[PDB]
Amino acid sequence: ASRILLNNGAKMPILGLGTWKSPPGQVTEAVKVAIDVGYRHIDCAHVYQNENEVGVAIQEKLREQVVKREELFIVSKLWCTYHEKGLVKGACQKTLSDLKLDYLDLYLIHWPTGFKPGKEFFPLDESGNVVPSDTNILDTWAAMEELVDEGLVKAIGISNFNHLQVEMILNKPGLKYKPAVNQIECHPYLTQEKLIQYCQSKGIVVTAYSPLGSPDRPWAKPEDPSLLEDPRIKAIAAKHNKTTAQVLIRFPMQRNLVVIPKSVTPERIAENFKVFDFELSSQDMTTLLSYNRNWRVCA
Ligand SMILES: NC(=O)c1ccc[n+]([C@@H]2O[C@H](COP(=O)([O-])OP(=O)(O)OC[C@H]3O[C@@H](n4cnc5c(N)ncnc54)[C@H](OP(=O)(O)O)[C@@H]3O)[C@@H](O)[C@H]2O)c1
Ligand SMILES: *CC(=O)[C@]12C[C@](C(=O)OCC)(C1)C2
């Protein structure tokens, strides 16, 4: 099965293309190649600063008759400076305009924390701390629900929400739509077993971000661990005649997760799609889960 049924009745492709850190001048080609090779799910965000160029690729592939819109599953996210109820719709409309789309398949609250609204993505103060906004996730959620009612988005969800934050949404007085997805960091060093089990028990699909460990993340240091170079994981890959990246993508798939590896390199975009022709064993899965160290790319 290449798609997972969401609680809104739509089917979400279990493999998607990530676009954080994909330069504007390279992401159009990346999305074009991804669609050609079979990807039908693109993970986007306003803060990635490249939605226009993602949209150019989508429009070109629609024009070429490679895909139709209903075959694509386009995800974007609401940035922290737009958590005020009155700003959510405008943020969504700006993303739709940049992507050249009439609707999104899924729109996520990018992080539970609201930041001061304004012209800074990351308003900071002298202590190095973010300037927050007078917002809370329940009022922001009500504004997200309105986007579903208006037909701008087919599903709404959350990202980087912990157990208690998910529970706060689910217990929200007046709740209209449950979150369809929680998108969280997940890989062998941060396996998220409890949060995943909780979300799945509530019918919330989990998407694993940074599944390769985000080796291109800013501020990576030589002392940091590296999933792609972990010899224990290389050994599992060699056993299956696959690459380490392919093992790391297949791992979340066998946990009934969606996974969104990022690449701008055509060969790697294609390699990362070749994960439907093999199975990790039960022991492979248990062994990968045993590597958890609660180590986060995104703190
Ligand atoms: N919701 C959130 O807060 C959040 C946070 C983080 C990420 N995300 C989403 O999740 C996506 C994936 O996470 P990520 O971008 O942090 O990192 P990632 O997908 O774990 O890793 C991307 C890095 O791996 C390299 N790579 C890709 N395929 C490879 C392969 N087959 N062999 C070797 N290297 C390979 C890429 O290189 P090249 O691109 O140069 O090929 C890039 O350096 C993001 O792009 C974004 O869409 C969301
Ligand atoms: C990893 C972490 O933390 C993070 C937040 C982010 C974004 O998105 O930014 C903007 C670009 C993910 C970084």
XYZ file of C-alpha atoms and ligand atoms in Angstrom:
360
model
C 0.000 0.000 0.000
C 1.455 3.338 -1.089
C -1.117 5.586 0.665
C -2.575 5.800 4.184
C -6.208 6.692 4.860
C -6.646 9.872 6.895
C -9.519 10.634 9.247
C -11.005 13.019 6.626
C -11.365 10.153 4.133
C -8.491 11.212 1.871
C -5.533 8.959 1.035
C -2.102 10.412 1.783
C 0.957 9.077 -0.090
C 3.319 7.475 2.415
C 6.386 8.893 0.621
C 6.751 12.618 0.070
C 9.476 15.030 -1.023
C 10.828 17.374 1.639
C 11.764 20.941 0.635
C 13.401 22.565 3.689
C 16.867 23.848 2.627
C 16.105 23.296 -1.063
C 17.364 26.482 -2.755
C 14.864 28.405 -4.886
C 17.082 27.872 -7.920
C 17.134 24.072 -7.458
C 13.773 23.143 -5.954
C 11.819 23.499 -9.212
C 13.955 20.819 -10.866
C 13.756 18.677 -7.712
C 9.945 18.690 -7.667
C 9.765 18.046 -11.424
C 12.056 15.028 -11.105
C 10.198 13.779 -8.031
C 6.855 13.878 -9.851
C 8.371 12.122 -12.863
C 9.751 9.285 -10.767
C 6.452 8.768 -8.928
C 6.236 11.080 -5.936
C 2.722 12.406 -5.425
C 3.237 14.237 -2.093
C 5.318 17.396 -1.582
C 6.012 18.813 1.896
C 6.204 22.626 1.828
C 6.235 25.574 4.195
C 6.081 29.329 3.928
C 9.236 29.615 6.075
C 11.192 27.490 3.577
C 11.240 30.587 1.319
C 10.777 28.533 -1.860
C 7.031 27.929 -2.289
C 6.920 29.979 -5.485
C 9.489 27.700 -7.104
C 7.709 24.549 -5.870
C 4.553 25.946 -7.459
C 6.313 26.513 -10.778
C 7.231 22.815 -10.883
C 3.698 21.680 -10.051
C 2.215 23.952 -12.713
C 4.665 22.683 -15.327
C 3.807 19.035 -14.609
C 0.086 19.803 -14.761
C 0.607 21.562 -18.106
C 2.662 18.620 -19.412
C -0.174 16.218 -18.473
C 2.147 14.168 -16.271
C -0.293 14.419 -13.353
C -3.630 16.032 -12.550
C -4.206 18.074 -9.414
C -6.343 15.435 -7.667
C -3.431 12.971 -7.874
C -1.127 15.279 -5.907
C -1.057 15.675 -2.124
C 0.357 19.120 -1.305
C 1.161 19.971 2.307
C 2.087 23.356 3.711
C 2.315 24.905 7.160
C 1.325 27.990 9.123
C 4.331 29.859 10.477
C 4.639 30.873 14.137
C 4.115 34.601 13.501
C 0.596 33.932 12.140
C -1.039 32.130 15.073
C -3.471 34.998 15.727
C -6.912 33.831 14.664
C -7.274 36.815 12.339
C -3.985 36.072 10.510
C -4.410 32.365 9.739
C -6.529 32.742 6.617
C -4.231 35.347 5.078
C -1.197 33.150 5.705
C -2.943 30.251 3.998
C -3.999 32.398 1.045
C -0.427 33.667 0.626
C 0.853 30.089 0.532
C -1.832 29.147 -2.011
C -0.920 32.149 -4.152
C 2.788 31.298 -4.027
C 2.118 27.634 -4.853
C -0.355 28.640 -7.631
C -2.965 26.315 -6.143
C -6.672 26.606 -5.384
C -6.489 24.346 -2.301
C -4.081 22.448 -0.094
C -4.481 18.776 0.765
C -3.150 19.382 4.278
C -2.257 22.517 6.252
C -0.313 22.128 9.504
C 0.371 24.361 12.468
C 4.163 24.340 12.043
C 4.997 24.614 15.773
C 2.789 24.930 18.879
C 4.479 28.203 19.919
C 3.178 31.506 18.553
C 5.680 34.295 17.868
C 5.063 38.059 17.856
C 3.363 38.974 14.555
C 5.323 41.159 12.175
C 8.045 41.217 9.538
C 10.485 38.899 11.367
C 10.236 35.120 11.046
C 12.126 34.795 14.360
C 11.697 37.870 16.581
C 14.298 37.543 19.356
C 15.124 39.630 22.439
C 18.379 40.417 24.219
C 18.251 37.200 26.290
C 18.342 35.180 23.019
C 14.719 34.147 23.597
C 11.904 34.383 21.085
C 9.314 37.122 21.430
C 6.058 35.148 21.805
C 2.561 36.165 20.841
C -0.602 36.311 22.942
C -2.030 33.252 21.236
C -2.878 29.723 22.247
C -3.188 26.583 20.217
C -6.958 26.211 20.778
C -7.887 29.581 19.251
C -5.404 29.007 16.439
C -7.020 25.600 15.880
C -10.470 27.195 15.526
C -9.034 29.438 12.795
C -7.554 26.394 11.051
C -10.982 24.701 11.205
C -12.479 27.688 9.397
C -10.140 27.022 6.452
C -11.675 23.568 6.047
C -15.177 25.049 6.138
C -14.203 27.582 3.444
C -12.726 24.890 1.184
C -9.191 26.262 1.154
C -7.764 23.046 2.637
C -8.963 19.447 2.657
C -7.395 18.580 6.017
C -5.705 20.338 8.914
C -3.069 19.066 11.262
C -0.249 19.838 13.635
C 3.530 19.611 13.733
C 5.950 19.296 16.637
C 3.066 18.793 19.088
C 3.773 16.640 22.130
C 1.290 14.293 23.796
C -0.260 16.955 26.032
C -0.588 19.420 23.154
C -2.328 16.811 20.977
C -4.613 16.049 23.930
C -5.450 19.738 24.343
C -6.695 19.895 20.748
C -8.652 16.646 21.079
C -10.330 17.903 24.275
C -10.947 21.374 22.878
C -14.433 22.640 23.741
C -16.288 23.131 20.501
C -13.880 20.994 18.466
C -15.060 20.613 14.881
C -12.225 18.757 13.111
C -9.658 16.471 14.696
C -6.069 16.859 13.479
C -5.485 14.553 10.536
C -1.694 14.415 10.917
C 1.019 15.205 13.437
C 4.344 15.788 11.658
C 7.260 15.141 14.045
C 10.983 14.484 13.952
C 11.478 10.726 13.810
C 14.442 8.471 13.024
C 16.434 5.751 14.826
C 17.962 8.209 17.308
C 14.545 9.731 18.151
C 12.020 6.951 17.686
C 9.013 8.671 19.327
C 7.414 5.359 20.277
C 5.017 6.737 22.877
C 3.883 9.783 20.894
C 3.367 7.692 17.753
C 1.391 5.031 19.605
C -0.793 7.743 21.137
C -1.462 9.548 17.858
C -2.188 6.296 16.006
C -4.591 5.197 18.754
C -6.520 8.445 18.189
C -6.590 8.065 14.403
C -3.974 10.785 13.786
C -1.462 9.797 11.111
C 2.175 10.570 11.919
C 4.626 11.945 9.366
C 8.315 11.460 10.145
C 10.521 14.438 9.298
C 14.327 14.469 9.105
C 14.276 10.681 8.499
C 17.895 10.732 7.305
C 18.997 12.857 10.244
C 19.056 16.131 8.296
C 22.772 16.003 7.402
C 22.501 19.419 5.683
C 21.037 21.085 8.797
C 22.635 24.404 9.776
C 25.135 24.111 12.616
C 25.883 20.401 12.130
C 29.141 19.627 13.932
C 31.739 16.881 13.421
C 31.053 15.434 16.892
C 27.366 14.921 16.107
C 26.079 11.439 15.335
C 25.307 10.613 11.735
C 22.604 8.125 10.819
C 23.828 7.816 7.223
C 27.321 6.868 8.429
C 26.256 4.708 11.409
C 28.001 1.356 10.829
C 25.166 -0.549 12.487
C 22.746 0.883 9.943
C 25.228 0.353 7.096
C 25.273 -3.320 8.117
C 21.473 -3.563 7.819
C 21.605 -1.842 4.424
C 24.289 -4.218 3.160
C 22.219 -7.234 4.209
C 19.407 -6.029 1.911
C 21.608 -4.695 -0.907
C 20.119 -1.227 -0.323
C 21.642 2.091 0.681
C 21.594 3.424 4.221
C 19.181 6.158 3.083
C 16.793 3.520 1.703
C 16.839 1.674 5.031
C 16.135 4.925 6.882
C 13.153 5.660 4.605
C 11.728 2.135 4.749
C 11.965 2.076 8.576
C 9.145 4.595 9.223
C 7.037 3.106 6.410
C 6.918 -0.216 8.308
C 5.697 1.661 11.410
C 2.661 2.894 9.407
C 4.172 6.379 9.167
C 4.407 8.814 6.278
C 8.000 9.873 5.547
C 9.320 12.955 3.741
C 13.031 12.716 2.829
C 14.481 15.879 1.275
C 16.758 15.999 -1.730
C 17.580 18.346 -4.593
C 19.823 15.738 -6.260
C 18.040 13.882 -9.096
C 19.844 10.571 -8.454
C 18.959 10.669 -4.751
C 15.341 11.689 -5.389
C 15.075 8.543 -7.524
C 17.031 6.342 -5.070
C 14.797 7.431 -2.186
C 11.717 6.283 -4.124
C 13.096 2.757 -4.571
C 11.827 1.592 -1.188
C 8.823 -0.505 -2.233
C 10.769 -3.609 -3.342
C 12.167 -4.839 -0.013
C 11.192 -5.409 3.599
C 13.129 -4.849 6.797
C 12.853 -7.885 9.050
C 11.231 -7.856 12.477
C 14.707 -7.962 14.011
C 15.913 -5.129 11.749
C 12.988 -3.051 13.035
C 13.558 -3.906 16.702
C 17.279 -3.213 16.300
C 16.686 0.185 14.675
C 14.213 1.061 17.447
C 16.847 0.082 20.016
C 19.093 2.914 18.787
C 16.861 5.599 20.291
C 18.784 8.251 22.217
C 16.204 11.096 22.182
C 18.601 13.119 19.973
C 16.860 15.973 18.125
C 17.838 17.869 14.982
C 15.023 20.315 15.778
C 15.103 21.431 19.413
N 7.689 20.221 10.589
C 8.944 20.584 10.877
O 9.228 21.287 11.855
C 10.047 20.076 9.995
C 11.372 20.065 10.446
C 12.357 19.470 9.676
C 12.027 18.932 8.448
N 10.751 18.999 8.006
C 10.400 18.448 6.651
O 11.023 17.188 6.508
C 11.902 17.198 5.361
C 13.041 16.223 5.541
O 13.862 16.596 6.678
P 15.259 17.349 6.507
O 15.251 18.210 5.291
O 15.516 17.967 7.830
O 16.335 16.186 6.322
P 16.478 14.721 5.715
O 15.382 14.477 4.701
O 16.610 13.800 6.832
O 17.926 14.846 5.007
C 18.148 15.722 3.883
C 19.623 15.629 3.583
O 19.937 14.277 3.177
C 20.562 14.288 1.905
N 20.129 13.099 1.184
C 18.877 12.861 0.676
N 18.740 11.686 0.116
C 19.991 11.102 0.263
C 20.510 9.864 -0.149
N 19.799 8.958 -0.825
N 21.809 9.601 0.126
C 22.529 10.525 0.773
N 22.145 11.726 1.214
C 20.856 11.959 0.920
C 20.114 15.593 1.251
O 21.098 15.986 0.271
P 20.735 16.710 -1.124
O 19.441 17.476 -0.947
O 21.937 17.603 -1.400
O 20.598 15.613 -2.150
C 20.130 16.525 2.456
O 21.456 16.902 2.784
C 12.277 18.672 5.266
O 12.862 19.002 4.013
C 10.914 19.326 5.500
O 10.106 19.151 4.334
C 9.769 19.544 8.749
C 15.138 22.005 13.182
C 14.376 23.189 13.691
O 14.331 23.448 14.874
C 13.746 23.988 12.661
C 12.646 25.113 12.815
C 13.004 25.043 11.281
C 12.490 25.857 10.211
O 11.618 25.569 9.422
O 13.127 27.028 10.161
C 12.695 27.954 9.122
C 13.421 27.641 7.873
C 12.942 23.474 11.406
C 14.509 24.973 11.708
